[PDB]
Design a protein. Structure first.
Length: 284
């Protein structure tokens, strides 16, 4: 069923909450034993959001290899993503260790540091060129190289140095700055423009490690970003684009990280974004 007609049907019958609960009921359940060990309690921002054991990213250190981060591997689309929580004051070093070890080229951030009067993640990158950051626990240095502030997003060039070997890599930071504190955007236009800026950067190409994408918990806004990107790529790749079923793609992604798409409003917005984005993919 063409998702645009599926969309109108759900919209007129006002059944988004019912569709979304069906997804919650059918979603995979896998163990998250490492995330729940007592030693890792202060490495999780939210008690109820954990990576599955089978897909968790492991830090390359014998000490404690745990970070709240998951590898989402989309086989048909040939896209991979790492979805993670916003870093905590005590996990900023782990975050940049993961970027280094997984060979990522881009980081996508979908939240502001403060929302609704509370901190939603640590200030984990430098705000001035001349004030670099050193992470002593993981032996990394991070420098702001350039910053381009736009109306709906900011792009930064960062340099990450492994102080142990003195290799350096350029990391691109894509920061969507205008998602509202409550609810979802009224139009998907600025979110789609942002998605295509990330694509155009080369950060998603298979020559690099997986892009790292985060919000506060790493499941809601972050889920919307990867769901829209994967659905649009499949519509480009297949004989028959109308065969792409957004609910089936979402359940496949939920095999790799729990709770992706947190509300029925986020589900509806994901449909809207894919429908409007198709009117570029399909040669409109």
């Amino acid at each position: 069923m063409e998702m645009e007609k599926e969309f109108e049907q759900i919209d007129k019958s006002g059944s988004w909450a019912a569709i979304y609960q069906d997804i919650r009921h059918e979603a995979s359940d896998f163990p998250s034993r490492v995330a729940k060990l007592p030693k890792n309690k202060n490495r999780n921002r939210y008690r109820d959001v954990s990576p599955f054991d089978h897909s968790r990213i492991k830090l390359h250190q014998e000490d404690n290899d745990y970070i709240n981060a998951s590898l989402i591997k989309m086989e048909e689309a040939q896209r991979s993503y790492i979805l993670t929580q916003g870093p905590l004051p005590n996990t900023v070093g782990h975050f940049w260790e993961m970027v280094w070890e997984q060979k990522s080229r881009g980081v996508v951030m979908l939240n502001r540091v403060m929302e609704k009067g509370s901190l939603k993640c640590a200030q984990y990158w430098p705000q001035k060129e001349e004030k670099e950051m050193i992470f002593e626990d993981t032996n990394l240095k991070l420098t702001l190289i350039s910053e381009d502030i736009k109306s709906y997003y900011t792009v930064r060039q960062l340099e990450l140095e492994n102080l142990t070997t003195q290799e350096t890599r350029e990391i691109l930071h894509f920061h969507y700055t205008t998602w509202p504190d409550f609810g979802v955007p009224e139009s998907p236009a600025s979110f789609l423009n942002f998605l295509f800026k990330v694509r155009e950067s080369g950060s998603l190409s298979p020559e690099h490690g997986p892009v790292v994408v985060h919000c506060s918990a790493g499941i809601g806004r972050s889920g919307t970003f990867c769901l829209a990107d994967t659905c649009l790529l499949l519509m480009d790749k297949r004989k028959d684009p109308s065969s792409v079923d957004i609910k089936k793609v979402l359940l496949e992604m939920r095999k790799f990280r729990m709770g992706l798409i947190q509300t029925a409003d986020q589900l509806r917005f994901s449909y809207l974004a894919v429908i409007e984005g198709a009117k570029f993919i399909m040669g409109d």
